[PDB]
Structure formats: C-alpha cells, structure tokens
C-alpha cells in the first residue's frame, strides 16, 4: 500500500543524530506538550478539528486533495501526474514508513496516555499500537510544503503554512504530541535536502514544475472547497 | 559587511505567516525556555561553551571554518570559492538581517532578562539592544546544514547535525531562547526552499558541488581541529 520511496535506506536522514530525546517526565518540555494538548482539545467539535480529520488521510488522493487549495490548482494523476507520483514517493521517504522501532524512542500517544478519543476514531486501532517517533504526518506535511513551495514559488507562503498546519493537525486530532510534530519538521526538512541529491526526485520535480505552470496558466482551479478550508484554517496570516 | 542576498525582499519567507507567537508569560512554553537556559548554563566554562563562542562568529571566514570539519574539507576562497560565496550570500538571506522589527515580535534575550553574561562578551553591546525574532544564527545554521548536505550527500548527517548544533550554540551562549532557536529552523528550511527557485543560487550550488567533490577526491583535509570540535560537540557515531 506504499509507493517506492526515492531514497535508499542508507540515504535516509538519521533520526538519532538529528533529534533530541523526547520530553522527559516531570520536565517543562513535557508540560509544554500537555499545555499544547489542552489548547488543541479546546477545538474539539470545530471546523478546524474536521479539517484535522481529513489531514490525517495518507491514502492517496488524500494528500493531493489536502494541498490543492494552497497550490492553486488540483493535484491529480490526470493534471499533474509527476507531482502526484512525487507526493506518493516522498510520503514513503518522509513519513512514518522509515520510523522503525529499532534505534527509536517508543512514544505513547496523547489519546492513549489520557484514555480519550481522537478526531479519526477509525485510525485508532492502528495508532494505539503505534509509537512512531517523531510524527510522520508532520514530517511529510513540511516536506510537501517545502517541495511544493519550490514548485510554485508564487504560492510559497500558502504552501509552507499549509504544510505546517498539516503537522499541527496531529495535535488538534489528539494523535501525537506537539514535540513530535516539531521534531517531525526537522526530519521533513532534512529529507527534502536528501531528496535534492536524488536524480529520480529531481526529474519528477522538474516535470512537476511544468505541470503546475501549465495547469495554472490554463486556469485550472482546485476541485476542493477552498473557501471552507480557509475558514477551517482561520488564516488571518 | 554583508554580501548581497540571493533573494529579492518579496521572495523572503514571511515570519508572521510561518511562526507562532513566542512563549507567553506564565506558560509551560516559557517554562521550557527557562529550563533549557538552566541546562545550558550548566555548561559554562566547558569546551561546548567555547565552541559556541566561535559558532557565534558570523563575520567570514567564521561560518566557513565552522562547517569545514562536518564537510570533510576546508571551505575557503582558494579551494571552494563558489561554496564560500554561497555561504556569504545565504547568510544575508537566512541570517537575521532580514528580521526587521516592523511586523515582528520584540524578544528580550535571556542574558538581558537575567542580567548575566554570554559566551561572547564582545558582542553584548549590540545584542543587548537587539530583539530579533527568531534566532538568525539558528536559521542560517540549519539553512547551511541543509544546503551543504545536498552538496556532499555522503556527509549529510554530519552536516545537518552541525547546522542544528550551530543553532543550539545560541542557547549555550545565553544569547537567545530555545523557542527562538527552534523557530529559526523553520525560517532556515523555508529560506532553502525559496533559494532552490533562485537561478543565481542554483548556479553557485552546482559549482560548489564540483568544488567540494574535487577537494575531497584530492584529499584536502579540513584545516580545523576536528578532534577538538568532536569532543566539544559530544559526537556519536
């Protein structure tokens, strides 16, 4: 159910070297995670939580739909085949697929710690047994934001903001801690640096730039309710 | 003093859109900043503090020297002129000179809040009146780490680790808060994404890849004490 990643395992960024240990028990860092959790759970029942629910969808075309409004055009196999492929393959590179248990911290997720629910009840049987470190959604979101921003520089701010919000959706969903979302962005940026050393990624990147240019010049607007996503995001950037 | 940046002002990543507010008074987020400050000040008098003192040097060849050991060859005008230039110009893009006080938070630095000293007494007269948001050293450190990792993919982990440590040196030096160092990496990664859309940067990047490869193949060792830097950093293989 996973596309081949661009990167060989030996070329993946090394979590242990790049990341610090998770917040220790009794630490202010852990208190910051609980504070972020409490602030996030205040949004339970809101449109932002509902957007966090669709942000959790990693099965394509999930991510493609999620980033279309920020891109200004629809990401699809028909319109942007190379960009679509790039997002699928970089999900493997940046996401939870690389986060093995060996040489990794085991992270008990917030909703398990506090015996409460998430914004995606259907994904919980998987997440309960999952202690991935850091947040793979966060890493993929930031990686997607950084690559897409390079693909369409005229929408760089919208795309990078959307990629950051994608990681924040994991806190709002009560699926992972703030610190793991923050650490996810370190891995996401690092993975993008490695991808720029990969000729296969670079070829798809170059083709995606032409696809997006062609779609925007032809006036293809996103096939998503960008108004509703904007409201859910709050914007006021 | 400052080299021309690659990026036009309109192409700089927008701090206000990408970053959250600084830790509020009485918050666990602020408590985390104080906790990191206390852990950092325990290293006063140590080799790690001494390395943070040279990590503070933004006047070239300061940054070139700082990353040479992680690169595996000396960054110099003679041996890697385009890489040297690239670091100088990306210092302007990423390194805080763009952090205008207008439309930005004013940050009182830790050593000012606690009427104490930094690891660089000579730089305090400027830093005392400076409330830059986030950490420009951190942003440049992470940006340099990410670009250099693409330049020399075989040393990607060493270089990205060094770029994160470069930002952490600001906490160890008591020059800025942890949260501003963390936010610095968001801006650094964003700036790198913008840089990959800039043809002048891309031309220097391609030449730097050839310069570094030629230097490493000729066996040009770093002209820095890599043993001493390894001990000060606590490096683990």
Residue numbers in the entry:
A (entry chain C), B (entry chain A): 38 to 274
Please, what does the article write about this entry?
The truncated model generated by AF2 enabled the determination of the M2‐32 crystal structure at a resolution of 2.2 Å, derived from a crystal belonging to the P 22 1 2 1 space group. The structure revealed that M2‐32 forms a tetramer, with a Matthews coefficient of 2.5 and a solvent content of 51.4%. In the crystal, the tetramer adopts a dimer‐of‐dimers arrangement (A‐C/B‐D), with a buried area of 1129.5/1137.1 Å2, and a free energy change upon interface formation of −23.5/−22.8 kcal/mol, as determined by the PISA server (Krissinel & Henrick, 2007). Each monomer includes residues 45–271 exhibiting an all‐alpha fold arranged with 14 helices (60%), connected by turns (5%) and coils (35%) regions. The structure is stabilized by two disulfide bridges and belongs to the “acid phosphatase class A” protein fold superfamily (SCOP). The first disulfide bridge forms between Cys105 in helix H4 and Cys263 in helix H14, while the second bridge links Cys156 and Cys210, both residing in the loops regions. M2‐32, however, presents an additional extra bridge on the opposite side to the active site of the enzyme. DSF assays suggest that M2‐32 is a thermotolerant enzyme with an unfolding T m of 47°C and, accordingly, this high stability may be conferred by the presence of two sulfide bridges in the monomer, which contrasts with most acid phosphatases that have only one disulfide bridge. Docking studies with adenosine monophosphates, combined with site‐directed mutagenesis, identified His174, Arg207, His213, Asp217 as critical catalytic residues, and Tyr136 and Ser172 probably involved in substrate recognition. Mutations at these positions resulted in over 90% loss of enzymatic activity, highlighting their functional significance.
